[PDB]
Design a protein around this nucleic acid. Sequence first.
RNA 1: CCGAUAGUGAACCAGUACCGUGAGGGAAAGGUGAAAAGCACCCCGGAAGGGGAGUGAAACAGUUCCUGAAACCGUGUGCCUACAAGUAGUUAGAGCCCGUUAAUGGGUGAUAGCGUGCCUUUUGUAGAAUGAACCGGCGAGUUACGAUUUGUUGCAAGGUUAA
RNA 2: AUACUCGGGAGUCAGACUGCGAGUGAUAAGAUCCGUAGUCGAAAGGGAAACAGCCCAGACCACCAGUUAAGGUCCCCAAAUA
RNA 3: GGUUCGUGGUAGGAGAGCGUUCUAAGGGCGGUGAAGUCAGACCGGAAGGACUGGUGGAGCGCUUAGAAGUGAGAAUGCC
Lengths: 110, 116, 53, 101, 142, 47, 154
Amino acid sequence: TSAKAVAKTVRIAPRKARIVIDLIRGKQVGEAIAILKYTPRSASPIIEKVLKSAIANAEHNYDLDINNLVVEEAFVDEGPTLKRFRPRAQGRASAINKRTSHITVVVSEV
Amino acid sequence: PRVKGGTVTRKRRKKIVKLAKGYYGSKHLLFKVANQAVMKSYQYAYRDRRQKKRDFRRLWIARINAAARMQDLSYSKLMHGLKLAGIDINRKMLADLAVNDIASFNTLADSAKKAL
Amino acid sequence: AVPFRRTSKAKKRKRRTHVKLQLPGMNECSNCGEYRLSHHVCPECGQYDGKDV
Amino acid sequence: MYAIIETGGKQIKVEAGQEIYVEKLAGEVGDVVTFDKVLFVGGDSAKVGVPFVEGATVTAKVEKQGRAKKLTVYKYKPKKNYHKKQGHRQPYTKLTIDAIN
Amino acid sequence: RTTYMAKPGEVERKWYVIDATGVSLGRLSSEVASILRGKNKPQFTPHIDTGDFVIIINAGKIGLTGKKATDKIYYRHSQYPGGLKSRTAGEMRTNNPEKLLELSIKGMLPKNSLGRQLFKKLHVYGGSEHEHAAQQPEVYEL
Amino acid sequence: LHELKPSEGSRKERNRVGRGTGSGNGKTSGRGHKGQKARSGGGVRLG
Amino acid sequence: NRSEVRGGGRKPWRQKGTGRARQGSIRSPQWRGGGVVFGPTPRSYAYKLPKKVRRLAIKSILSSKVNEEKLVVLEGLTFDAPKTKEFAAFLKNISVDTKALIVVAGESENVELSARNLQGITVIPAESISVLEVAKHDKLIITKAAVEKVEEVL
RNA sequence: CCGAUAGUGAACCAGUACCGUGAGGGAAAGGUGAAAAGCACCCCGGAAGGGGAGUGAAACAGUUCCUGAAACCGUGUGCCUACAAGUAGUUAGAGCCCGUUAAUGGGUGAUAGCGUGCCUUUUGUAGAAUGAACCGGCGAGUUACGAUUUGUUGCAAGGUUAA
RNA sequence: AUACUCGGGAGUCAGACUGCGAGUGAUAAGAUCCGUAGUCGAAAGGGAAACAGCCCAGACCACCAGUUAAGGUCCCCAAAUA
RNA sequence: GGUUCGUGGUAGGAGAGCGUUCUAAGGGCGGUGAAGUCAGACCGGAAGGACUGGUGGAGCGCUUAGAAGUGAGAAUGCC
Ligand SMILES: [Mg+2]
Ligand SMILES: [Mg+2]
Ligand SMILES: [Mg+2]
Ligand SMILES: [Mg+2]
Ligand SMILES: [Mg+2]
Ligand SMILES: [Mg+2]
Ligand SMILES: [Mg+2]
Ligand SMILES: [Mg+2]
Ligand SMILES: [Mg+2]
Ligand SMILES: [Mg+2]
Ligand SMILES: [Mg+2]
Ligand SMILES: [Mg+2]
Ligand SMILES: [Mg+2]
Ligand SMILES: [Mg+2]
Ligand SMILES: [Mg+2]
Ligand SMILES: [Mg+2]
Ligand SMILES: [Mg+2]
Ligand SMILES: [Mg+2]
Ligand SMILES: [Mg+2]
Ligand SMILES: [Mg+2]
Ligand SMILES: [Mg+2]
Ligand SMILES: [Mg+2]
Ligand SMILES: [Mg+2]
Ligand SMILES: [Mg+2]
Ligand SMILES: [Mg+2]
Ligand SMILES: [Mg+2]
Ligand SMILES: [Mg+2]
Ligand SMILES: [Mg+2]
Ligand SMILES: [Mg+2]
Ligand SMILES: [Mg+2]
Ligand SMILES: [Mg+2]
Ligand SMILES: [Mg+2]
Ligand SMILES: [Mg+2]
Ligand SMILES: [Mg+2]
Ligand SMILES: [Mg+2]
Ligand SMILES: [Zn+2]
């Protein structure tokens, strides 16, 4: 009835992925793909591949109608953080979180 | 033998956090602020079980006052009248009659006037 | 200089009410049959929707 | 026809077939309870008490002898390391009123 | 338990018209506050608003005993430095009597959200003519 | 051996200080507030 | 304890100025891998009540067994060869079918061996009868020769 | 006696890594499954990563893979919220939404009353005094030998053994 | 209705204000130092707007019962436009 | 079992208890699902204790005694 794709531990900060994923939530897949194509953000290409993967799953595995699909669910979960250090003045090092994202897109008929 | 701090701590703190259900933001999530909020809620509830009794008597008295002034008595005269008459009906019952059975309240207000 | 109190979740979320993207200004082309930015050249057809190149 | 009776240091307004909660009375679940202290009788002939209406009674049958929902009474004094927690369940008798006399 | 509590729009709110002529500003105000609050009704419920609507007419003829006409000062501060303006009760009874009675009565209403709703039920007129004839106002005596 | 009952009053439970205010020996653990006698190893020699 | 834990020697950082809690050693007890404050030390738990109380205790536990009727006095008890099947059969003939302390005098090497592999059964000399051994077992099977030796002591 | 913040500093290639000119200081880090049967094949994708299919008792056991709490981050929505001045609750209380360990039930809360966190330290702290960002774990009257006193038990003008 | 005696265990040795009686001071101080009583300290509740130390009064728990204290009764705000 | 007088409380004295790990002994539960974990409107005067369902996948209660590394919200605590 619905088809899901996940991109696990993508090396992009969740906040940066979410501000884009919020555009495509509830949209028809055709419009969703257009919105991502014309949203100039680092997250857009990554979310496009998850969405097109979900559509391929819907067509190949569950034999759903691709022209009829809507983005039922889309959300970004925190992945494991890479911990780094930037040297600051006076010998002090400051933490840098190289955060990762799990990007989930679910597509459904209507 | 060694006793590690296993489970008893989590069980105790989780009960306190559940008692803080419905409280704003951190107050329903975090043990330290939930524990303060629950202590304070219990203190207010203790205080308010006493205040509740005062509050309802003020409500009843205000309603008896309103219904008595419709019979050309103040609350202070009516209650004196009922005392002299020997009528022992309490303010909660009078306030109930004054809203629900005004005819009955007027009968008592007459008994009061007679005693005065 | 420094935050006097940590910012609550509610207050943080209220501040971010306006931190969002707008949808791109796009529309379906006739010759292509796919979406394009207005006042831009459509790559699907490979030229400007109106003016042929 | 409704009456006002004195029960458990309080006054309550009863009609026939009404189910009331009062302070614990002596009585098994079958037992009939007579209230002798009737302050007022209403309904088309207001009989008024000075203070109790002589020969007036309300009869009821005991439906349940129970304990109210658990209350937790907790006191503390800030900065004095004083806390006191106490559980409370107030006993009650659930009566159904049979007849006003 | 069993104590009655009025519901919003349960108690019939009536329209009263009160002639202010020759009555002390207070005395009129204190009685009107009680009517607005619903203290004269046995259905009175502290959280609901069971009170009546009040039209005051002839507010220009409102009484000010002693030297209150010249000596009772009404202050406003803009919240700008040195932004304190003052008016005498007398000047305000001549030029803005609707304002004078509103100030007087506002002070005698509960200082809360419900108190601000009660104030909306008060209509003050300097002269003898209001335009609320549609509400079929009934004359009220103090 | 599953029904052992030591003589009534021969054994008593030891008092444990510093285990919360409910016990009456919490926080200051019976020592009161400050001074030499409140300190670890505190107290003057016998006489 | 904080003295016995590896390392700890130095003050981890200066007393004042760093904005950190003052610390004396990385093996202080509030530190993760640090010393234990009190906790177990090797000690004996052994103590003896006076001789007279210890004699009263064995007399009283043995009297209890007679009162309850758990004491079975055997004429002989011996085995030609160490045979556990024979000892098991013996216990059924006496109708034990519980835990039981067997007390024997005459060397009877075959009695110890024959009962060794049975789970509830303990065979002891008679000189070796103790309050805890009698308390650990339901029935007390004793040979006449052993009774003589127990009475000889008590 | 400990059971992975414990027990050795070290359950693991640890006096290692790392720090220091050097003497010296000195970590972190255990668990797929009974068995690799460790996912053929198809699909989207450059890959990563997914979705099927298959293995298996289980894959929400998928090569760091028993369990998987809390902080913290999200998606969805039942009730409320844009005239209000708020230590955030509590008491009263409509309305709306539910239906339980079945109880004078659960969720939410228009409006009304009352209401200055916790701890420490103080004559006195809501304090414009101290401490705590949050959650978790760890983290403080112990043992030995003496003294004394109370209780218990045995024996009693006796009682008791030490090595 | 307690005293006293003998044992075991303490904590306390920064006090505060109010009234009264004194000193010091200026017949100043929320000053200071004694005496005497009270409250706070270690005391919630009601009043004094708010307000440890003032006025009234002591919280074992529950009640949508009642009577009073100081203080109050035109409205905010319960009770007299006595 | 009644009667009478009591039951604010810091330092502090006194008492009775709850719960944690381990041992003994009795007696049990558990792949027809142990511990843990999650949820709930249940029970006790308190510390606390059950029940039911999810997750979990193999150990754990109870009774009476015994022994303690036995209870954390604060230490500019340590990780
Ligand atoms: Mg440098
Ligand atoms: Mg004790
Ligand atoms: Mg104490
Ligand atoms: Mg504390
Ligand atoms: Mg201290
Ligand atoms: Mg001191
Ligand atoms: Mg001291
Ligand atoms: Mg050292
Ligand atoms: Mg700092
Ligand atoms: Mg040191
Ligand atoms: Mg280590
Ligand atoms: Mg260690
Ligand atoms: Mg280690
Ligand atoms: Mg572990
Ligand atoms: Mg992993
Ligand atoms: Mg609004
Ligand atoms: Mg406005
Ligand atoms: Mg700080
Ligand atoms: Mg001793
Ligand atoms: Mg002074
Ligand atoms: Mg004095
Ligand atoms: Mg003090
Ligand atoms: Mg007080
Ligand atoms: Mg007040
Ligand atoms: Mg205080
Ligand atoms: Mg009263
Ligand atoms: Mg009275
Ligand atoms: Mg009034
Ligand atoms: Mg007490
Ligand atoms: Mg008392
Ligand atoms: Mg003690
Ligand atoms: Mg265990
Ligand atoms: Mg778990
Ligand atoms: Mg400990
Ligand atoms: Mg912490
Ligand atoms: Zn085109």
